[PDB]
Amino acid sequence: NYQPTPEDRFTFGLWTVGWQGRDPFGDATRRALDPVESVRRLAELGAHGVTFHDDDLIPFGSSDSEREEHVKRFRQALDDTGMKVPMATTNLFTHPVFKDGGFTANDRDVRRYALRKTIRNIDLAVELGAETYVAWGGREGAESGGAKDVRDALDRMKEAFDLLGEYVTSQGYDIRFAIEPKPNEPRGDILLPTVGHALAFIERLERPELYGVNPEVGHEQMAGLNFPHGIAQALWAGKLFHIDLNGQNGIKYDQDLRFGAGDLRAAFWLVDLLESAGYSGPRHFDFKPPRTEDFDGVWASAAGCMRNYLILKERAAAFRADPEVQEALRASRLDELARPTAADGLQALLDDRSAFEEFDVDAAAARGMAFERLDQLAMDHLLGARG
Amino acid sequence: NYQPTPEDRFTFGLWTVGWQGRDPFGDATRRALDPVESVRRLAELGAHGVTFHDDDLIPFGSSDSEREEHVKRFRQALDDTGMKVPMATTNLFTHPVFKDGGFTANDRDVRRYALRKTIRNIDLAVELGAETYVAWGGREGAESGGAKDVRDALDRMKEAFDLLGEYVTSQGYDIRFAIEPKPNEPRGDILLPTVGHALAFIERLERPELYGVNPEVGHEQMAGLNFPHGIAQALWAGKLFHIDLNGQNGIKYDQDLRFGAGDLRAAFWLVDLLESAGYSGPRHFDFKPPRTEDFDGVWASAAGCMRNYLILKERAAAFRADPEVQEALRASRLDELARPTAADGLQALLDDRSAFEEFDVDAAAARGMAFERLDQLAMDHLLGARG
Amino acid sequence: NYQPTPEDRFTFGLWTVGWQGRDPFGDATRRALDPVESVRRLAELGAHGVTFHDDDLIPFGSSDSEREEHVKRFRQALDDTGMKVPMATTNLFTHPVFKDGGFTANDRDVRRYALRKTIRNIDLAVELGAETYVAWGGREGAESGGAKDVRDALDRMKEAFDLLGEYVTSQGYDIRFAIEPKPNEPRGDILLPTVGHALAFIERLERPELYGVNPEVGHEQMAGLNFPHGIAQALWAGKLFHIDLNGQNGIKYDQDLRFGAGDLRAAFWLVDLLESAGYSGPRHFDFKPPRTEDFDGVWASAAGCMRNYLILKERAAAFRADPEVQEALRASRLDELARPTAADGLQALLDDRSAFEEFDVDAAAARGMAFERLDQLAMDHLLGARG
Amino acid sequence: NYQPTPEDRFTFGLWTVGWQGRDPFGDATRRALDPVESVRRLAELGAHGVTFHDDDLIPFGSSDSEREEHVKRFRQALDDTGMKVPMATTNLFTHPVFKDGGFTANDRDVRRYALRKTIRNIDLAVELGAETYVAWGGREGAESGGAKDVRDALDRMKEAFDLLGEYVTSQGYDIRFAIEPKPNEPRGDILLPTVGHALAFIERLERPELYGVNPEVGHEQMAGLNFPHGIAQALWAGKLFHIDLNGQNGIKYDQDLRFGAGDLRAAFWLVDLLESAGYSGPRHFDFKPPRTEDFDGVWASAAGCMRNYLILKERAAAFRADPEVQEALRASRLDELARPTAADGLQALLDDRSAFEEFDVDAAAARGMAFERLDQLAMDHLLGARG
Ligand SMILES: [Mg+2]
Ligand SMILES: [Mg+2]
Ligand SMILES: [Mg+2]
Ligand SMILES: [Mg+2]
Ligand SMILES: [Mn+2]
Ligand SMILES: [Mn+2]
Ligand SMILES: [Mn+2]
Ligand SMILES: [Mn+2]
């Protein structure tokens, strides 16, 4: 009873199911997929849409005439299936010209080329109906301390994004930008390494309302961070424009496992948050079917992403609806956390002797928080052991 | 030739050299230090000032009459030595009443008490001449996913800091706030876990100009992050109000080793940045002399903090002054990174055929970055092997 | 369901439910428990038995007559409840004399005292019926590289365990030793940091048959290692004498969460392994009820340890019993992994042209492993989504 | 100074300086190197010798006659330069047939092929003068818990190494095996993930004397472990047959930076240990010149490997030779750590009242270890600040 449909807003990158399995120590294990084949197979699995890098759809170096042909066959598969393109991005990391970055390469001419490559694909994305344009600065960074003056690099990064915002404003495009953070890999350290750093950077752009974040489960977990907490901060700031769902087993290389794999309880709390907060954007899977798998395994992995989301959504809803959980939340004073600390104001607080001079600190210290009972109720619901 | 003097602006917390050595598995190994003794011994070592938590100087629960006596002896040691108090902070983490937080405790009455405790110590800090008031939210967080609604918690955190800003504004105090991030410990996950998250949070406060960050070497390194990069972002934002220097060996418990220990090359690049950028604030050591040490070892550890900074400052200056390094920086195009990408503007960039239509991507891709020669010159300077 | 009974062999350390909640940054939040109370409360929850450090039972420094009194009360509570004592250990880490270690302290007189303290408690352990004596060398290690010659320290460690083995054999005691590894905390690096290092060390003892490992879920995960894989290697070597179950969220301080929390899927695969291998020793919980909790929360946390084991045991049994899973294990060739590679022998392999000269490597390379289907079946079973 | 010469025993893999720069997210940035060119360039830099995978030298799939041709050219370059081949290994990880492992692939026919591929290259290695044959099981492992029965996989791993040992003994080859551990990447978890796990596994082989370890700096650091401590345990066991030197910044993807980069103080203590223990095997660099570099940068990186070893060797020798350091080692009682704990024997220890009944634990507890003074002396020596 966990069948996905387009209403679930599940999306997949062309580069995900299309990943050929080349890793840093190994050759490809699967043939390349025709973008049109991926569109059709994903439609049959119940996906709502696809996403792409420019270079996933149009082979690097194509003439404008070849470019038009690739875009035409792709659009003809979209129209035939009803599939949507909610997000696009630029590949500024594969070609050797980007070995030191795109927007923050030390060479000025490479930075200008990176901007021209990006702008060209923004035109295409808006044409196909994308609402979000993602930037993953995978090559913006350094292996060594002297190679990059980070204040100058952030000036250049701000310059690039300001120019992109000027471009979409002057064209009158309805599209927003989302920065995808990652702490490391393929560079030793990547600029804007977490959701927090990206959120802070946006506030210094000329038009901050145009920019948000596209956090990825695995990337925050590569810094050991709590992904639901980071998503909560992004929602609190009004900046969760898109999200990348997958799996990661802790601090190591970027695994991009299927969603649900990796940290299972973190996935449960993530789904609880997105659904409770009314997140209405795409549920996008930036994952890689392991290279052990043939093409049947590729489609099983993709179907598993969607299935695990739906199972967790049902368990999260049951948790929140259970009156015993409702009572546990009161016992742990989750409702008091929603109450203003001092809506009576500063003067009243300073005059309030029960807040300090007469506060029974030891009685307050003796109150248990009852967090373990609440968390075991959450366990039981996740495991389907309520009964 | 590495003797510290007050001009080096080295400061120490009372809780650092005063750490008695109680750890999660062990009893104290050293007697408590009288604050007056620490002031005098640190003055003799060449320190510029001390910092304190309220509860380091005034034992928790003291009457206002006892409070005045503790403050009076302390001020009499400050006046006798010329020692400064550039920073103070509140202890909102030791007493059991704070077991679920201060500003974001689920219980509303604890949040009101935490604010009253903080405001009382702001008065004292301004009286003693502190320029910066630090907040380390060590207990703001959770071990389990249901225990804390993080959007509500951030509402409460914003409320607390807004009220503190209203208080200092209405009193006309010349003091600024600095948030000290930490990703975890003693809570399973701490709110505002990195420099980035804290920078982003500040931008949503009512008076953001009043607030900056107090990053700590070890804390960013507990998330595997590059501390010089994070400091560079804070400087770029204009938000580096204070800094905590110490040592950490990677991702594990918060070690608070003496500065220079832990990640030595990261310390070299940190000093290079602070000195090149003209950071003029305190060089504050938030460290703990290991509990293996007696009191001689405590003062050797503190002296070592200051010594390692001065050695690294000399090596960093020699690196930047070396004409061979100056040439290597040009060879790696660090100067081009300082140049605007497109100060000719968007229209000109779009019309510039050399930036895309006629860009020789393969010639540009063949250019080496010469980063390894530069980094070995940096190695040689750090090791004093230039000759 | 999921009610624990004594046959389930669940055990708890006195120091687990007895943890008063003091951590590196905070005071105790709970009063101390009488060991007699812990025995009776744990019996009521359905535990099989209790374990202890010498210092958990007999306050450090007690006279021989005060000692006998505390032992008397404890034994009475055991006799009244039928509760077992399957394991005991020595506290060689809390008292300041052990600040540089016990068995490997640089000071020779401390090492001799450590051995005498341990031997005294071995006698007590055998009296109470313990079959395993655990050693956690929590202070054996260093913060700095010069402080410890690790070759000499391993000589001292081997000497200590060799002397202990000579003592138990000369007494005719039925008791085996188990080393509990941990990578760090409270020392910067701890000797024998993982299951593997401990297994290697045992092979150099004079009587290796007397020694095995006591691995702990959270400790191996503090090095980012796969705990089921490590337990498999210990079982393969015949050295899994005992196990410590708890939860841990990745690489950070030692959290000691209740079992099932932390990494839930790793908990599932661990229980699958222990049950399918027929491990018949204690299921011991080395955990700390979070300091947010009162005593009701302490007992809810302990009961949750046992509940989560029983739920996971049911799910793993259902996984293995599922004919569809048995078919997927065959599709992924798990049964071929148990076939010897070359039971026909070295000469036959060298002459077998189908193993090289005529091996179709491209046809072999194209076979999918079908691991993703198998893993989604395991996911469905864990979540109770089969049926 | 710091000019390397052949007596320094520096060696390099063909695959190190030959790395073309392809990573999981990018194409090659450098052309392929002729192995004959690498031999001659490395000889000019002062290297002692080269190492190789079979597939580095002979393109995979080559006929027997094409094979002999490539070997011929290589041997000519060795004869012309005097360059040694102290070590060789098998590539069991690049070709897609090895996607589930070589020795522990689930498919039995792949395991047999893996053994034949290895045996063919052992013959070549012995011809060229290799004394050590290295095995890095980079594909032995799993991404998911059900995909591999680790007990059966360890049986298959033991079978393979037992067959290899039978082959070399039946041929009368003078060659020993060394296992290279790695915790993860490219598999989610790799079997025998650390030095300790590998040492334990060797003790269960039929001919343990034939097998040792080839530890790599970066791999142990990828588990957050102390690499000098691990090397000390391997030396203590008589199993350090070979070593891989490089640099790594903490827990993340396998960086393979040049030696000295990464964790500089750990590099210092490593060199101190190897030189003071008299390790006389190859100083092998398993590193990757960053893909930002052209071929000038490739040779600068390789030369930097050797330079940094020689600088650190000089500093550690000066540290150990310093009378003031010798006095500090005595103050910290390093000499007492080498004294047997109880050479008077078990009976004497039990009767010695000064070891327990009359031991002044409080006086012992008050002794400082003086570790911070000793470590600052080591810091001064590393930085060249003594004198
Ligand atoms: Mg992504
Ligand atoms: Mg601090
Ligand atoms: Mg334990
Ligand atoms: Mg290697
Ligand atoms: Mn990823
Ligand atoms: Mn700290
Ligand atoms: Mn633990
Ligand atoms: Mn490596």
PDB file of N, CA, C and O in Angstrom, chain C residues 28-70:
ATOM      1  N   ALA C  28      25.819  16.577  38.939  1.00  0.00           N
ATOM      2  CA  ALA C  28      24.867  15.474  38.985  1.00  0.00           C
ATOM      3  C   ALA C  28      23.433  15.991  38.984  1.00  0.00           C
ATOM      4  O   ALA C  28      23.118  16.983  39.641  1.00  0.00           O
ATOM      5  N   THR C  29      22.550  15.317  38.231  1.00  0.00           N
ATOM      6  CA  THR C  29      21.126  15.640  38.234  1.00  0.00           C
ATOM      7  C   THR C  29      20.277  14.619  38.984  1.00  0.00           C
ATOM      8  O   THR C  29      19.073  14.845  39.149  1.00  0.00           O
ATOM      9  N   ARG C  30      20.853  13.495  39.400  1.00  0.00           N
ATOM     10  CA  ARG C  30      20.134  12.448  40.114  1.00  0.00           C
ATOM     11  C   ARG C  30      20.910  12.035  41.357  1.00  0.00           C
ATOM     12  O   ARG C  30      22.145  12.060  41.380  1.00  0.00           O
ATOM     13  N   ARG C  31      20.176  11.629  42.391  1.00  0.00           N
ATOM     14  CA  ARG C  31      20.846  11.156  43.592  1.00  0.00           C
ATOM     15  C   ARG C  31      21.445   9.777  43.332  1.00  0.00           C
ATOM     16  O   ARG C  31      21.113   9.095  42.356  1.00  0.00           O
ATOM     17  N   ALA C  32      22.336   9.355  44.217  1.00  0.00           N
ATOM     18  CA  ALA C  32      22.944   8.045  44.053  1.00  0.00           C
ATOM     19  C   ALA C  32      21.947   6.943  44.411  1.00  0.00           C
ATOM     20  O   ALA C  32      21.088   7.106  45.283  1.00  0.00           O
ATOM     21  N   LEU C  33      22.060   5.814  43.715  1.00  0.00           N
ATOM     22  CA  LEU C  33      21.221   4.649  43.969  1.00  0.00           C
ATOM     23  C   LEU C  33      21.931   3.668  44.888  1.00  0.00           C
ATOM     24  O   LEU C  33      23.118   3.394  44.717  1.00  0.00           O
ATOM     25  N   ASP C  34      21.193   3.123  45.842  1.00  0.00           N
ATOM     26  CA  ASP C  34      21.704   2.000  46.622  1.00  0.00           C
ATOM     27  C   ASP C  34      21.806   0.784  45.707  1.00  0.00           C
ATOM     28  O   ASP C  34      20.836   0.465  45.005  1.00  0.00           O
ATOM     29  N   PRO C  35      22.955   0.108  45.654  1.00  0.00           N
ATOM     30  CA  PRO C  35      23.063  -1.087  44.797  1.00  0.00           C
ATOM     31  C   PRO C  35      21.984  -2.123  45.072  1.00  0.00           C
ATOM     32  O   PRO C  35      21.554  -2.815  44.140  1.00  0.00           O
ATOM     33  N   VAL C  36      21.514  -2.230  46.319  1.00  0.00           N
ATOM     34  CA  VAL C  36      20.425  -3.151  46.634  1.00  0.00           C
ATOM     35  C   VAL C  36      19.142  -2.729  45.934  1.00  0.00           C
ATOM     36  O   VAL C  36      18.359  -3.577  45.483  1.00  0.00           O
ATOM     37  N   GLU C  37      18.898  -1.417  45.834  1.00  0.00           N
ATOM     38  CA  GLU C  37      17.726  -0.956  45.096  1.00  0.00           C
ATOM     39  C   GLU C  37      17.827  -1.289  43.614  1.00  0.00           C
ATOM     40  O   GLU C  37      16.820  -1.638  42.986  1.00  0.00           O
ATOM     41  N   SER C  38      19.022  -1.136  43.026  1.00  0.00           N
ATOM     42  CA  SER C  38      19.180  -1.415  41.604  1.00  0.00           C
ATOM     43  C   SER C  38      18.929  -2.884  41.302  1.00  0.00           C
ATOM     44  O   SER C  38      18.275  -3.220  40.304  1.00  0.00           O
ATOM     45  N   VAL C  39      19.451  -3.777  42.142  1.00  0.00           N
ATOM     46  CA  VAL C  39      19.203  -5.208  41.949  1.00  0.00           C
ATOM     47  C   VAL C  39      17.704  -5.494  41.932  1.00  0.00           C
ATOM     48  O   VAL C  39      17.194  -6.219  41.065  1.00  0.00           O
ATOM     49  N   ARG C  40      16.972  -4.936  42.893  1.00  0.00           N
ATOM     50  CA  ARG C  40      15.554  -5.269  42.991  1.00  0.00           C
ATOM     51  C   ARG C  40      14.749  -4.645  41.860  1.00  0.00           C
ATOM     52  O   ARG C  40      13.824  -5.280  41.342  1.00  0.00           O
ATOM     53  N   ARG C  41      15.075  -3.408  41.463  1.00  0.00           N
ATOM     54  CA  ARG C  41      14.337  -2.769  40.378  1.00  0.00           C
ATOM     55  C   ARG C  41      14.588  -3.479  39.050  1.00  0.00           C
ATOM     56  O   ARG C  41      13.665  -3.652  38.245  1.00  0.00           O
ATOM     57  N   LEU C  42      15.837  -3.885  38.807  1.00  0.00           N
ATOM     58  CA  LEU C  42      16.179  -4.579  37.570  1.00  0.00           C
ATOM     59  C   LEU C  42      15.535  -5.959  37.514  1.00  0.00           C
ATOM     60  O   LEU C  42      15.095  -6.403  36.447  1.00  0.00           O
ATOM     61  N   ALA C  43      15.457  -6.651  38.656  1.00  0.00           N
ATOM     62  CA  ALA C  43      14.746  -7.928  38.690  1.00  0.00           C
ATOM     63  C   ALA C  43      13.279  -7.751  38.317  1.00  0.00           C
ATOM     64  O   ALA C  43      12.726  -8.545  37.549  1.00  0.00           O
ATOM     65  N   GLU C  44      12.643  -6.691  38.822  1.00  0.00           N
ATOM     66  CA  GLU C  44      11.240  -6.427  38.501  1.00  0.00           C
ATOM     67  C   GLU C  44      11.028  -6.142  37.018  1.00  0.00           C
ATOM     68  O   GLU C  44       9.961  -6.453  36.477  1.00  0.00           O
ATOM     69  N   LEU C  45      12.027  -5.576  36.336  1.00  0.00           N
ATOM     70  CA  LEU C  45      11.903  -5.325  34.902  1.00  0.00           C
ATOM     71  C   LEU C  45      12.177  -6.558  34.061  1.00  0.00           C
ATOM     72  O   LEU C  45      11.989  -6.510  32.840  1.00  0.00           O
ATOM     73  N   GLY C  46      12.594  -7.661  34.670  1.00  0.00           N
ATOM     74  CA  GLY C  46      12.868  -8.874  33.933  1.00  0.00           C
ATOM     75  C   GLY C  46      14.314  -9.103  33.536  1.00  0.00           C
ATOM     76  O   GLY C  46      14.567  -9.971  32.694  1.00  0.00           O
ATOM     77  N   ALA C  47      15.265  -8.365  34.106  1.00  0.00           N
ATOM     78  CA  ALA C  47      16.675  -8.599  33.805  1.00  0.00           C
ATOM     79  C   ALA C  47      17.148  -9.939  34.349  1.00  0.00           C
ATOM     80  O   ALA C  47      16.646 -10.438  35.352  1.00  0.00           O
ATOM     81  N   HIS C  48      18.163 -10.493  33.691  1.00  0.00           N
ATOM     82  CA  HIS C  48      18.798 -11.738  34.119  1.00  0.00           C
ATOM     83  C   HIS C  48      19.802 -11.501  35.241  1.00  0.00           C
ATOM     84  O   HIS C  48      19.958 -12.349  36.134  1.00  0.00           O
ATOM     85  N   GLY C  49      20.494 -10.368  35.225  1.00  0.00           N
ATOM     86  CA  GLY C  49      21.574 -10.196  36.184  1.00  0.00           C
ATOM     87  C   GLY C  49      22.157  -8.798  36.125  1.00  0.00           C
ATOM     88  O   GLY C  49      21.708  -7.946  35.352  1.00  0.00           O
ATOM     89  N   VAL C  50      23.155  -8.570  37.002  1.00  0.00           N
ATOM     90  CA  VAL C  50      23.817  -7.281  37.172  1.00  0.00           C
ATOM     91  C   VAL C  50      25.321  -7.514  37.094  1.00  0.00           C
ATOM     92  O   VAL C  50      25.811  -8.626  37.295  1.00  0.00           O
ATOM     93  N   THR C  51      26.055  -6.442  36.786  1.00  0.00           N
ATOM     94  CA  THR C  51      27.513  -6.454  36.751  1.00  0.00           C
ATOM     95  C   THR C  51      27.997  -5.249  37.554  1.00  0.00           C
ATOM     96  O   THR C  51      27.211  -4.358  37.904  1.00  0.00           O
ATOM     97  N   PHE C  52      29.292  -5.219  37.875  1.00  0.00           N
ATOM     98  CA  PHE C  52      29.751  -4.160  38.767  1.00  0.00           C
ATOM     99  C   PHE C  52      31.241  -3.925  38.581  1.00  0.00           C
ATOM    100  O   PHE C  52      31.981  -4.848  38.244  1.00  0.00           O
ATOM    101  N   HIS C  53      31.657  -2.668  38.778  1.00  0.00           N
ATOM    102  CA  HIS C  53      33.031  -2.344  39.158  1.00  0.00           C
ATOM    103  C   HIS C  53      33.190  -2.507  40.660  1.00  0.00           C
ATOM    104  O   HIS C  53      32.258  -2.228  41.420  1.00  0.00           O
ATOM    105  N   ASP C  54      34.411  -2.856  41.101  1.00  0.00           N
ATOM    106  CA  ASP C  54      34.652  -2.900  42.546  1.00  0.00           C
ATOM    107  C   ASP C  54      34.179  -1.616  43.222  1.00  0.00           C
ATOM    108  O   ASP C  54      33.495  -1.653  44.252  1.00  0.00           O
ATOM    109  N   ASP C  55      34.496  -0.462  42.632  1.00  0.00           N
ATOM    110  CA  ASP C  55      34.147   0.793  43.283  1.00  0.00           C
ATOM    111  C   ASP C  55      32.657   1.135  43.180  1.00  0.00           C
ATOM    112  O   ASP C  55      32.217   2.071  43.857  1.00  0.00           O
ATOM    113  N   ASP C  56      31.866   0.408  42.369  1.00  0.00           N
ATOM    114  CA  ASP C  56      30.417   0.615  42.373  1.00  0.00           C
ATOM    115  C   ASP C  56      29.778   0.064  43.639  1.00  0.00           C
ATOM    116  O   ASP C  56      28.723   0.544  44.070  1.00  0.00           O
ATOM    117  N   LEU C  57      30.390  -0.962  44.223  1.00  0.00           N
ATOM    118  CA  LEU C  57      29.824  -1.761  45.301  1.00  0.00           C
ATOM    119  C   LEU C  57      30.381  -1.387  46.664  1.00  0.00           C
ATOM    120  O   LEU C  57      29.620  -1.290  47.636  1.00  0.00           O
ATOM    121  N   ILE C  58      31.693  -1.166  46.724  1.00  0.00           N
ATOM    122  CA  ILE C  58      32.471  -0.893  47.931  1.00  0.00           C
ATOM    123  C   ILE C  58      33.120   0.475  47.762  1.00  0.00           C
ATOM    124  O   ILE C  58      34.028   0.614  46.928  1.00  0.00           O
ATOM    125  N   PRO C  59      32.698   1.503  48.501  1.00  0.00           N
ATOM    126  CA  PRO C  59      33.301   2.835  48.329  1.00  0.00           C
ATOM    127  C   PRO C  59      34.818   2.781  48.447  1.00  0.00           C
ATOM    128  O   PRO C  59      35.365   2.118  49.333  1.00  0.00           O
ATOM    129  N   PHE C  60      35.500   3.470  47.528  1.00  0.00           N
ATOM    130  CA  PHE C  60      36.962   3.444  47.486  1.00  0.00           C
ATOM    131  C   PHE C  60      37.531   3.849  48.842  1.00  0.00           C
ATOM    132  O   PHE C  60      37.077   4.820  49.456  1.00  0.00           O
ATOM    133  N   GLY C  61      38.517   3.090  49.316  1.00  0.00           N
ATOM    134  CA  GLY C  61      39.135   3.361  50.600  1.00  0.00           C
ATOM    135  C   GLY C  61      38.545   2.614  51.778  1.00  0.00           C
ATOM    136  O   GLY C  61      39.078   2.733  52.892  1.00  0.00           O
ATOM    137  N   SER C  62      37.477   1.842  51.567  1.00  0.00           N
ATOM    138  CA  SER C  62      36.799   1.145  52.656  1.00  0.00           C
ATOM    139  C   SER C  62      37.741   0.190  53.381  1.00  0.00           C
ATOM    140  O   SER C  62      38.589  -0.463  52.765  1.00  0.00           O
ATOM    141  N   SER C  63      37.581   0.099  54.699  1.00  0.00           N
ATOM    142  CA  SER C  63      38.303  -0.919  55.448  1.00  0.00           C
ATOM    143  C   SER C  63      37.795  -2.306  55.069  1.00  0.00           C
ATOM    144  O   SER C  63      36.702  -2.463  54.512  1.00  0.00           O
ATOM    145  N   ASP C  64      38.598  -3.324  55.402  1.00  0.00           N
ATOM    146  CA  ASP C  64      38.209  -4.706  55.126  1.00  0.00           C
ATOM    147  C   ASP C  64      36.874  -5.063  55.763  1.00  0.00           C
ATOM    148  O   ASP C  64      36.120  -5.868  55.205  1.00  0.00           O
ATOM    149  N   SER C  65      36.562  -4.483  56.924  1.00  0.00           N
ATOM    150  CA  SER C  65      35.315  -4.819  57.600  1.00  0.00           C
ATOM    151  C   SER C  65      34.134  -4.071  56.996  1.00  0.00           C
ATOM    152  O   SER C  65      33.050  -4.644  56.844  1.00  0.00           O
ATOM    153  N   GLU C  66      34.323  -2.791  56.663  1.00  0.00           N
ATOM    154  CA  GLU C  66      33.318  -2.061  55.897  1.00  0.00           C
ATOM    155  C   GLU C  66      33.062  -2.733  54.554  1.00  0.00           C
ATOM    156  O   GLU C  66      31.919  -2.800  54.090  1.00  0.00           O
ATOM    157  N   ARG C  67      34.124  -3.233  53.916  1.00  0.00           N
ATOM    158  CA  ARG C  67      33.989  -3.977  52.669  1.00  0.00           C
ATOM    159  C   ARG C  67      33.016  -5.140  52.824  1.00  0.00           C
ATOM    160  O   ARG C  67      32.019  -5.236  52.099  1.00  0.00           O
ATOM    161  N   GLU C  68      33.293  -6.029  53.784  1.00  0.00           N
ATOM    162  CA  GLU C  68      32.458  -7.210  53.984  1.00  0.00           C
ATOM    163  C   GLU C  68      30.997  -6.829  54.191  1.00  0.00           C
ATOM    164  O   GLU C  68      30.090  -7.525  53.718  1.00  0.00           O
ATOM    165  N   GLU C  69      30.753  -5.705  54.868  1.00  0.00           N
ATOM    166  CA  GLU C  69      29.387  -5.249  55.117  1.00  0.00           C
ATOM    167  C   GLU C  69      28.664  -4.913  53.820  1.00  0.00           C
ATOM    168  O   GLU C  69      27.497  -5.277  53.632  1.00  0.00           O
ATOM    169  N   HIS C  70      29.322  -4.160  52.933  1.00  0.00           N
ATOM    170  CA  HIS C  70      28.686  -3.820  51.666  1.00  0.00           C
ATOM    171  C   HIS C  70      28.456  -5.060  50.815  1.00  0.00           C
ATOM    172  O   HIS C  70      27.406  -5.191  50.177  1.00  0.00           O
TER     173      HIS C  70
END
